[PDB]
Design a protein around this nucleic acid. Structure first.
Ligand SMILES: [Zn+2]
Ligand SMILES: [Zn+2]
Ligand SMILES: [Zn+2]
Lengths: 231, 202, 107, 606, 47, 57, 100, 167, 222, 59
RNA sequence: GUACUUC
DNA sequence: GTCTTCAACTGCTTTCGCATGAAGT
DNA sequence: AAGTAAAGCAGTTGAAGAC
């Protein structure tokens, strides 16, 4: 019963939600095709520009609102650029947080505009960049997930279709069906082989890590006995 | 809890409005006009006139018959007004169509005329048929009537004819005109045409 | 259309104040009356129906069953789309002691 | 479902309930007394199991409804029992109250302070007041005088009434009461706390005496136990301050404690604010009658040589013959010992018969049966989930299943279907001036040759067949397809012609076992009067993951143009070119056209 | 385990809005998902 | 009685036999292939009791 | 009939309060594929029962194809009534809705 | 293929007589049944065709037991079976054998001894198939695109061996 | 008090075989007084004595009992024999549901005789359009079991209470097993034919055990 | 005949029936006939004019 | 119910 | 420093109950 | 002959104010 409601939020039958928006992006897999290779749309500029027809949607939505606040978020984000989010403030919430991409033009994701401005940074190319920016903007907005689609069964299909192929026993830890079926449905508890990965600093060496390996590794008391003779 | 059960039994049989006597003209004003809320469907063939559609399918055969809710025989309609499913003063309306059938569901209230005879009132009747145990009475020549053999006075007698129906002789022995006072006893409409039953002893 | 329109569609009779589909009666009609459908659960025996003067009846509620008994009640009943296995589901869940009651709109 | 006759109502909400000792008397039409389904000579008996009162049986005329087995929807009946029985569907629930309720004070062994505490916190929990729920607990201000407990109760009332007032005042909740996916977690945690309550400890704070513990017999006959010396000594000092339990005793116990603790009982058995203000009784858990399904639903099944009645008729017959045994039992005592051991055994066996009708994993371990008889719930769950056979997916009509075959020269969406499947499968289409030229051809041809029509229906909803009418009748009916209705009562509707198939409609296809989104696709068909089996495409087998080594898929046909619309725009193959798993297009020719493609586009090809 | 689940349900006597598709398949009007999460109206000129 | 055992397939043993399964003892050769006739006369079935066993040892 | 007036008043006030004006609407102003197939199906069953068509038919004998022909010229006289999880509707008119 | 069906009477004197009686019975179905209620040999039977038209003692009429399948087929024999007894007992069990036309059409499955299988897609004559310079016409054609994965090279070595074994 | 039996009410304390089941239980007093058949024993031609009975068919079963009674000393044997004509007509034409279409076959039968049969051997169907024509009815298979009672209880008095099993099954179009079982519900005793009863009809003695007959002894079996 | 296509499924009175006079039926029925005249209803017209000759004149 | 077979 | 009332506790045993898609005989 | 886990049970389980 989970599905994207008509307010760009995945809701249940009763009305409770799962997330604020589908993966924070709300773009379908059937349209996530050329969102990382801008050389494709740049090489077929007039091709897709004729079929998207941005001139028919200039009097329909707003442009300067989400672009002004996007420049505000881009500036406030590029100023800090040094420390993670355990001390950095969130005074400028993302354009996705206040504006869903289905109301106006400009509301985009984070990795999309980051790799976009990276592409534009290493792009030196007779088409200009302004109408190409509105071109890719309308292209990203067109790929917005249609509200009302059964995204749930799609998600279970994404985790069920590989299950027909990933069925293999051994291709130290558990893998495959005994692990997937264990975590998803068996009410995960104390497991046969628990695992945890511990990083280390750059000054410590491998000749010092094994010392902590022996100190932390629990040894049985019976493994220091040659033989047990009793008369 | 004894009267609590009968509280629902009494509020389902009590008549809403009564028909008293007026002007002492013998009969009584028993033709009332009850506004009713009617929940009906539509037809796509009459989408260009939904009020005319329901008027043709659910309103023209509706007239001149006895129903169960208002408990009387309808005698015309008025006040054809439809209701929308959203707050508006324009002529254009909207009707919620069922996603299963091409018909749409509308909930419109209309004031319907209706005539209901109570038990123990007085009405009019003309001469329609004169049988040996059944006289013909037509109040406003639209509502048929019938009588049994045990609802007539002992003095009122009948005499058969010989030339060419049945003759009747009253207590004093003089015929009267077609205009006849009459009382109401029972009503029945599940047959072909509406017909009321009455008595002659009060 | 795949699940309901194939074979499991019927237009049964549901009552408002009883919320049952298997309890309604299709009684034998009168000599002059036709299509007399009523409900048995929302009806009390006529021998107890008595009375603050004695109120009469408009004869629209009087109807006889097949066995000759007489009980008044259960008048209003509409036609609703119901699956046949639902007509067996409410019969089975009622057989194990649990009562079922739908509701219809309006009211 | 006929598009002519619509539905005049909608089902949008459902509420459960329990039977009442007053309504179990008027819900039936005739009792069932004799322990027999039918006597000799082949006919039912009066007041029998397969009686004509609760429905027709074997083309008989229904005595109550007055109709045959094609219009009578059945009726209801029951059987009178001597003593109220238990219910395994509720025994595991009210036994908590049965083992916790005091026997002399008739209250819960807790104190009225904590009983009203849980009853008040729950009295506030039905609405969306989880914030004020824990705020009710943290109020403690002032073996001890009861006056301070009275003002505590008045404090609980004056606080909850004010909190509920403000909640119902300003936008928080409506009178119907709010219910989310967290308030049930809190209520289930609270009722589980009530199950982990005093029941696992001793003394009663209201009346200080030792009450014996109910020793579970396990699947019937709960029986009491004895006491010890430290219990009877308390029975001596309380002066100045393995036995079976009959049904009427616990009947009076639960009947008194329910009317005594109705303040907490009214909500502990309610999830929503009870507007009707019903009064639950002890009869909600004790069964006085056993309602029987209609005879039309209990038709005696036959398979080959063996002929026998329905499975439920065996257990019910055992209840009938044993109910009459225990019925005539009290007549010996009335006309006034081992007969007392035979009435207690009658109680245990009457119980062992009704609970055997309601459960099978409890009663008699017979010897190698190979299989017991399914009474109610193991027939409602054949392999623990029978709901999947009927309640979840029905046996769908208008189906076609046969082997498949590939075809070239198909633009990825045509499905070659044989005329032998085309003549059977049909589709309704209303008559108008819209298809006066094509429909008259489909009717004038008939089911003998394609394109034809199978059945014709009129405005009144009647069925007219054409498989047994010649071409002359096909002409007299062809000149009648366009004609106004009889009366204005059916002036809006029109006739519907069932035509076989065209090259424009949409047809659904599915491959078993389906395990993903692309394993369920619909296309359009293009008939070919050549051979017998189905036809497929080269690119569709890649999505279905099917082969040609004996694999066969299904052919389902939609009965609505709206289904044709969503199967032409949404379920069409083009919209399913990309599977919504990782962005990998499951489409394209596999082996031969690419292996020849390499030689085609190569430079060594002029 | 619809038996024990019916014990837990009817013991409390809750209210079911038949919103989920599993409930909209046992009674059903259209659905709660897809093209069955809304309704359709029809505008006509006259009043 | 012997005709009933061969017909249905299961044995009515008052005392029971060493093997655990109580079914799957006879088959009907519809006489379709001579290879099926010889192979049916030398069948080696592990046991219907091992049809619900999990491990593939 | 007084109780009926109470039910009439409570449904009136809950319907007007449930409604959303034409300016506070902030949903997607696009023609979805689900609403497309919805109005194509509804138009097909509506026009198959002798309905007044607004576009001339050129020997077209397919209700779905004609319904799409009505969608192309925006002659479709239907209205989309949207829902919300909180139980609140929105009045979408197909006239002011552009198709992809 | 063959389908041997069995018809029985009585599943206490006899109640059914094999054949006709004395009352009036509709004609025109005598081409299939003899005078003793038994069919002929070498006839054509479809669905809705009398096989066992017998007379009754309880109702005194000739009812028809017919075939219930589409299966346009023929019959083979009419075997008479009966039990031994001191006092003679009239026969009440009749068996009959059918032969159905299993014409090789598309949809059927062919396979060799090497493991490879295949379904007949479309029956195609020599009108367009590749002919040899000698004159022989390849009746069956298998795709070379199964060997990369199915790896049925046994068909290769046995085609060369079979070529020499028949050359 | 099983409260119902498919057989009519029979007495158990009677003295004569012809009185163990009185004729009043077949035709009531209101209908037995309208059997004007005294003007039938006057004619001698067998064809003229059959063209006035309510039932005429292609068989000769009614004339089988008509052979050996002409004196008014056997009115009781002949009053029911006249009723036998109006009796077996409702059985072979159980398809018809109304009296008007049923009256088309019976050449002017007494209306009071057939009316009482409907009130006790058919299912009543009320209707104004129906009652305007005549009394509508319907025969459920439970009545098919009750109409076979007067079939097998009046023939007894006709053939002096020696009924053969096989001819009754042929003329009633019923299986001999069903006919024998109907004797057991009426109270009769079915068994093999004795050495004297087998010679009265002319059947071989070697099958007298397998060729059973019908009989009934007094007093009636409790 | 007693279906969802002819008879309305739900019907309930709106408010208290306000009783009317007798002379008003003359104004109602004459306007109803005038707006009507602009198969099973022709007899309804006959009985409508038959109840209109009562309070207006006398045959 | 028991057995058998199709990817 | 001893007599008193009162709220838990963690592990063994029992049980409720589980676990392919479809079809032909 | 296989797994997974909730319910009930009992010996440990002794813990906290007043006189
Ligand atoms: Zn009801
Ligand atoms: Zn019935
Ligand atoms: Zn207590």
């Amino acid at each position: 019963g989970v599905h994207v409601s008509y307010d760009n939020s995945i809701r249940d039958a009763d009305g409770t939600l799962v997330q604020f928006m589908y993966g924070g992006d709300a773009i379908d897999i059937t349209k996530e095709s050329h969102m990382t290779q801008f050389e494709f749309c740049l090489d077929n500029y007039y091709a897709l520009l004729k079929k998207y027809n941005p001139s028919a949607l200039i009097e329909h939505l707003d442009v300067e609102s989400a672009l002004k606040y996007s420049k505000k978020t881009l500036k406030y984000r590029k100023k800090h650029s040094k420390e993670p989010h355990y001390k950095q403030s969130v005074k400028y919430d993302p354009v996705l947080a206040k504006y869903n991409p289905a109301k106006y033009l400009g509301s985009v994701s984070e990795n999309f505009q980051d790799k976009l401005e990276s592409f534009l940074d290493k792009n030196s190319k007779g088409v200009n960049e302004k109408k190409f920016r509105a071109l890719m903007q309308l292209k990203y907005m067109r790929s917005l997930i249609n509200p009302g689609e059964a995204v749930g069964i799609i998600a279970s299909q994404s985790v069920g279709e590989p299950s027909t192929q990933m069925t293999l026993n051994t291709f130290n830890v558990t893998l495959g069906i005994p692990r997937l079926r264990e975590i998803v449905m068996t009410a995960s508890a104390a497991i046969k082989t628990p695992q945890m990965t511990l990083p280390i600093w750059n000054d410590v060496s491998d000749e010092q890590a094994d010392t902590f390996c022996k100190s932390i590794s629990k040894v049985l008391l019976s493994e220091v006995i040659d033989k047990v003779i009793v008369t | 809890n004894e009267n609590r059960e009968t509280a629902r039994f009494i509020k389902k049989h009590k008549k809403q409005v009564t028909n008293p006597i007026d002007e002492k003209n013998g009969t009584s004003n028993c033709i009332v006009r009850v506004p009713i809320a009617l929940y009906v469907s539509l037809a796509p063939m009459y989408l260009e006139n939904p009020l005319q559609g329901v008027m043709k399918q659910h309103l023209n055969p509706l007239v001149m018959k006895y129903n169960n809710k208002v408990g009387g025989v309808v005698l015309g309609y008025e006040g054809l007004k439809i209701l929308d499913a959203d707050p508006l003063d324009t002529s254009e309306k909207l009707i919620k169509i069922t996603p299963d059938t091409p018909f749409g569901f509308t909930w419109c209230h209309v004031n319907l005329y209706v005539w209901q005879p109570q038990v123990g009132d007085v009405l009019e009747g003309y001469i329609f048929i004169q049988s040996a145990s059944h006289i013909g009475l037509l109040i406003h020549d639209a509502f048929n009537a019938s009588i049994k053999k045990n609802n007539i006075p002992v003095d009122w007698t009948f005499v058969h004819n010989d030339v060419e129906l049945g003759h009747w002789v009253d207590s004093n022995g003089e015929p009267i005109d077609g205009k006849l006072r009459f009382t109401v006893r029972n009503v029945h409409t599940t047959g072909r045409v509406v017909s009321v039953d009455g008595t002659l002893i009060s | 259309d795949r699940l309901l329109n194939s074979s499991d569609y019927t237009q049964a009779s549901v009552c408002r104040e009883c919320g049952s589909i298997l309890t309604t009666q299709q009684s034998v009609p009168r000599i002059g009356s036709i299509s007399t459908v009523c409900c048995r659960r929302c009806s009390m025996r006529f021998e107890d129906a008595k009375k603050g003067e004695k109120i009469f009846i408009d004869d629209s509620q009087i109807w006889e069953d097949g066995q000759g008994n007489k009980f008044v009640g259960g008048n209003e009943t509409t036609t609703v789309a119901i699956p046949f296995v639902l007509k067996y589901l409410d019969s089975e869940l009622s057989a194990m002691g649990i009562r079922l009651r739908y509701n219809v709109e309006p009211k | 479902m006929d598009i002519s006759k619509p539905v005049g109502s909608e089902i949008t909400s459902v509420d459960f309930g329990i039977l009442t000792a007053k309504e179990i008397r008027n819900l039936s039409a005739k009792q069932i007394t004799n322990p027999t389904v039918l006597d000799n000579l082949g006919h039912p008996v009066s007041g029998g199991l397969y009686d004509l009162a609760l429905g027709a049986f074997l083309r008989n005329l229904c005595s109550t409804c007055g109709l045959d087995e094609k219009f009578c929807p059945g009726h209801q009946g029951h059987i009178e029992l001597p003593v109220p029985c238990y219910n395994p569907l509720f025994f595991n629930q009210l036994y908590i109250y049965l083992r916790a309720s005091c026997l002399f004070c008739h209250h819960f062994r807790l104190k009225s302070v904590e009983v009203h505490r849980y009853a008040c916190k729950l009295r506030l929990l039905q609405y969306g007041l989880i914030d004020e729920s824990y705020k009710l607990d943290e109020i403690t201000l002032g073996d001890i005088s009861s006056t301070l407990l009275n003002e505590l109760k008045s404090k609980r009332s004056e606080y909850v009434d004010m909190a509920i007032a403000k909640a119902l005042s300003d936008g928080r909740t409506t009178e119907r009461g709010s219910f989310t996916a967290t308030v049930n977690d809190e209520r289930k945690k609270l009722v589980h706390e009530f199950h982990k309550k005093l029941l696992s400890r001793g003394k009663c704070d209201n009346c200080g005496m030792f009450s014996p513990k109910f020793r579970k017999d396990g699947f019937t006959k709960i029986f009491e136990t004895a006491l010890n010396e430290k219990q009877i000594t308390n029975n001596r000092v309380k002066g100045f301050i393995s036995t079976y339990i009959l049904s009427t005793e616990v009947k009076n116990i639960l009947d008194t404690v329910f009317r005594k603790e109705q303040c907490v009982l009214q909500y502990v058995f309610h999830s929503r604010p009870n507007l009707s203000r019903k009064l639950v009784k002890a009869d909600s858990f004790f069964m006085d009658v056993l309602v029987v399904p209609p005879t039309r639903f209990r038709l005696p099944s036959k398979l080959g040589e063996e002929v026998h009645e329905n499975s439920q008729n065996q257990l019910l017959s055992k209840v009938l013959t044993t109910s009459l045994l225990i019925r005539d039992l009290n007549d010996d005592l009335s006309k006034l010992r081992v007969i007392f051991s035979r009435l207690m055994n009658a109680f245990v066996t009457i119980q062992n018969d009704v609970n055997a009708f309601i459960d099978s994993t409890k009663a008699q371990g017979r010897t190698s049966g190979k299989v017991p008889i399914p009474g109610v719930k193991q027939a409602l769950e054949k392999k623990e989930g029978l709901f999947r056979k009927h309640m979840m997916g029905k046996r769908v009509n208008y189906a076609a299943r046969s082997v498949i075959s590939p075809d070239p020269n198909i633009e990825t969406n045509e499905i070659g279907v044989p005329p032998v499947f085309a003549v059977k499968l049909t589709y309704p289409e209303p008559v108008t001036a819209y298809n006066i030229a094509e429909l008259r051809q489909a009717v004038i041809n008939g089911p003998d040759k394609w394109p034809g029509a199978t059945q014709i229906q009129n405005e009144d909803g009647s069925l007219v067949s054409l498989i047994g009418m010649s071409v002359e009748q096909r002409k007299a009916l062809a000149n009648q397809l366009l004609t106004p209705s009889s009366n204005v009562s059916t002036h809006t509707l029109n006739k519907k012609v069932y035509r076989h198939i065209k090259n424009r409609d949409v047809v659904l296809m599915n491959r078993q076992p389906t395990l993903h989104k692309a394993s369920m696709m619909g296309h359009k068909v293009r008939v070919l009067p050549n051979e017998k089996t189905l036809r497929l495409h080269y690119a569709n087998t890649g999505a279905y993951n099917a082969d040609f080594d004996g694999d066969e898929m299904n052919m389902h046909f939609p009965q609505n143009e709206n289904a044709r619309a969503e199967a032409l725009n949404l379920a069409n193959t083009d919209s399913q070119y990309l599977t919504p798993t990782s962005g990998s297009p499951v489409r394209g020719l596999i082996q031969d056209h690419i292996s020849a493609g390499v030689w085609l586009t190569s430079k060594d090809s002029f | 385990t619809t038996c024990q689940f019916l014990t837990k349900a009817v013991l409390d006597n809750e209210r079911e809005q038949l919103d989920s598709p599993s409930a909209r398949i046992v009674v059903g009007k259209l659905n709660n998902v897809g093209t069955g999460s809304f309704d359709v109206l029809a505008k006509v000129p006259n009043a | 009685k012997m005709q009933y055992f061969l017909s249905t397939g299961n044995l009515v043993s008052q005392s029971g036999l060493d093997l655990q399964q109580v079914s799957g003892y006879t088959v009907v050769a519809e006489k379709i292939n001579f290879y099926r006739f010889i192979s049916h006369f030398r069948m080696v079935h592990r046991g219907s009791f091992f049809a619900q066993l999990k491990t593939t040892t | 009939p007084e109780d009926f007036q109470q039910h009439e008043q409570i449904r009136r006030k809950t319907l007007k309060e449930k409604a959303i004006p034409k300016d506070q609407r902030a949903t997607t102003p696009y023609m979805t594929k689900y609403e497309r197939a919805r109005i194509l199906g509804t138009r097909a069953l509506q026009i198959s029962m002798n309905a007044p068509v607004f576009v001339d038919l050129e020997g077209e004998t397919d209700p779905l194809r004609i319904a799409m022909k009505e969608l192309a010229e925006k002659k479709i006289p239907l209205v989309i009534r949207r829902y919300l999880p909180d139980g609140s509707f929105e009045d979408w008119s197909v006239e002011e809705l552009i198709v992809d | 293929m063959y389908k041997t069906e069995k018809v029985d009477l009585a599943l206490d004197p006899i109640t059914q007589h094999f054949g006709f009686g004395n009352d009036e019975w509709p004609k025109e179905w005598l081409e299939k049944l003899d005078e003793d209620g038994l069919p002929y040999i070498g006839t054509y039977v479809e669905e809705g065709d009398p096989i066992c038209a017998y007379f009754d003692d309880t109702l005194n009429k000739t009812k028809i037991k017919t075939y219930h399948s589409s299966e346009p087929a023929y019959i083979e024999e009419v075997n008479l079976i009966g039990d031994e007894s001191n006092k003679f007992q009239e026969l009440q069990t009749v068996s009959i054998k059918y032969r159905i036309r299993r014409t090789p059409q598309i949809g059927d499955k062919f396979s060799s001894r090497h493991g490879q299988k295949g379904v007949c897609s479309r029956k195609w004559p020599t009108i367009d198939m590749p002919f040899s310079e000698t004159g022989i016409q390849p009746d069956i054609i298998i795709n070379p695109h199964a060997f990369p994965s199915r790896m049925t090279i046994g068909m290769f070595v046995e085609s060369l061996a079979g070529k020499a074994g028949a050359l | 008090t099983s409260n119902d039996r498919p057989t009519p009410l029979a007495n158990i304390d009677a003295t004569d075989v012809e009185q163990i089941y009185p004729i009043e239980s077949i035709i009531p007093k209101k209908e037995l007084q309208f059997i004007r058949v005294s003007s039938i024993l006057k004619e001698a031609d067998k064809e003229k004595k059959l063209e006035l009975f309510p039932y005429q068919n292609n068989s000769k079963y009614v004339a089988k009992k008509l052979d050996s009674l002409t004196q008014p000393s056997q009115m009781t044997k002949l009053q029911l024999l006249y009723y036998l004509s109006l009796l077996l007509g409702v059985y072979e034409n159980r398809r018809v549901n109304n009296k008007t279409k049923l009256l088309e076959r019976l050449n002017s039968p007494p209306e009071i005789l057939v009316d009482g049969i409907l009130s006790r051997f058919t299912v009543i169907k009320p209707g104004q359009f129906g009652r305007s024509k005549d009394r509508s009815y319907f025969i459920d298979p439970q009545n098919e079991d009750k109409i076979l009672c007067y079939i097998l209880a009046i023939i007894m008095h006709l053939d002096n209470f020696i009924v053969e099993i096989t001819p009754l099954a042929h003329e009633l179009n019923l299986k001999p097993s069903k006919v024998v079982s109907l004797f057991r519900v009426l109270g009769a005793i079915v068994k093999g034919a004795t050495v004297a009863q087998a010679e009265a009809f002319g059947i071989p003695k070697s099958t007298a055990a397998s060729y059973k007959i019908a009989t009934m002894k007094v007093p009636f079996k409790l | 005949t007693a279906t969802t296509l002819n008879t309305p499924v739900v019907i309930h009175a709106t408010q208290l029936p306000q009783h009317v006079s007798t002379d008003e039926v003359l104004q109602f029925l004459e306007s109803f006939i005038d707006e009507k005249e602009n198969t099973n209803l022709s007899s309804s017209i006959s009985q409508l004019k038959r109840i209109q000759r009562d309070f207006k004149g006398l045959p």
